[PDB]
Amino acid sequence: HMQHPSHELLKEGFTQHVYHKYRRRCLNERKRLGIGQSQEMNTLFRFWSFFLRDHFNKKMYEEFKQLALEDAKEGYRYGLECLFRYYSYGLEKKFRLDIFKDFQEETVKDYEAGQLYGLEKFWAFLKYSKAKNLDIDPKLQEYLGKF
Ligand SMILES: CN1CN([C@@H]2O[C@H](COP(=O)(O)OP(=O)(O)OP(=O)(O)O)[C@@H](O)[C@H]2O)c2nc(N)[nH]c(=O)c21
């Protein structure tokens, strides 16, 4: 009875009706309380991080990425941490060429912002994934070399 919506939606479990109401409440809280001030919004970031690993959808991924980056620019990094976990674990489970390009792009940005959370997640993807013949950004290769 006390199931959080994100827990219900992540069960083998997702319906549009439950997700619509949940997403709307989270976004409304982010708008009212402010970026980085809503713990409900944090549960939505976490939901996306896991849900997209098994049920990718382009528009949901794009919203996740956009809001995670907006939060991170203001200094609130949980969304982006969730996004890097999605990249590293999600692309290991099923490689996606377009999403991998985004993974490289956001890792480069994160490293150039003086963070290493993203770079470690990219390194981890390379250590765990069976993907071969990756076309890795030569600047990212330099960053990984020092890691
Ligand atoms: C199980 N893990 C762990 N991991 C990433 O790998 C990095 C190092 O964590 P770890 O591999 O769990 O350390 P590990 O040596 O296994 O733990 P321990 O030394 O206690 O035995 C973390 O950035 C973490 O997010 C992973 N990354 C991907 N893509 N897939 C995975 O299954 C895993």
Numbering used by the authors: 794 to 805, 807 to 941
Sentences from the paper on this structure:
Recently, we and others identified La-related protein 1 (LARP1) as a novel downstream target of mTORC1 and proposed that it plays an important role in the translation of TOP mRNAs. We have also shown that LARP1 associates with the 5’TOP motif via a LARP1 family-specific ‘DM15 region’ located within its C-terminus. We show that the DM15 region of LARP1 specifically binds the 7-methylguanosine 5’−5’ triphosphate (m7Gppp) moiety and the invariant first cytidine of TOP mRNAs. Biochemical analyses reveal that LARP1 selectively prevents the binding of eIF4E to the m7Gppp cap to block the assembly of the eIF4F complex on TOP mRNAs.
The conservation of the residues interacting with m7GTP in addition to the nucleotide-specific recognition of G8* and C1 from the DM15-RNA and DM15-m7GTP co-crystal structures suggest the DM15 region of LARP1 specifically recognizes the m7GpppC motif. To test this hypothesis, we determined the crystal structure of DM15 bound to m7GpppC dinucleotide. Indeed, this dinucleotide binds the DM15 region in the cap- and C-binding pockets. (D) Superimposition of DM15 bound to RNA and bound to m7GpppC. Finally, thermal shift stability assays demonstrate the interaction of DM15 with m7GTP and m7GpppC is increasingly stabilizing to the DM15 fold; notably, the m7GpppG dinucleotide does not impart additional stability to DM15 over m7GTP. Together with the conservation of the residues interacting with m7GTP, the base-specific hydrogen bonding of the Watson-Crick faces of nucleobases of G8* and C1 in the DM15-RNA co-crystal structure and the recognition of the m7GpppC dinucleotide in the DM15-m7GpppC co-crystal structure, these data suggest the DM15 region of LARP1 specifically recognizes the m7GpppC motif characteristic of TOP mRNAs. Furthermore, these data provide a molecular mechanism by which LARP1 differentiates TOP mRNAs from all other cellular mRNAs, most of which have a purine in the +1 position.
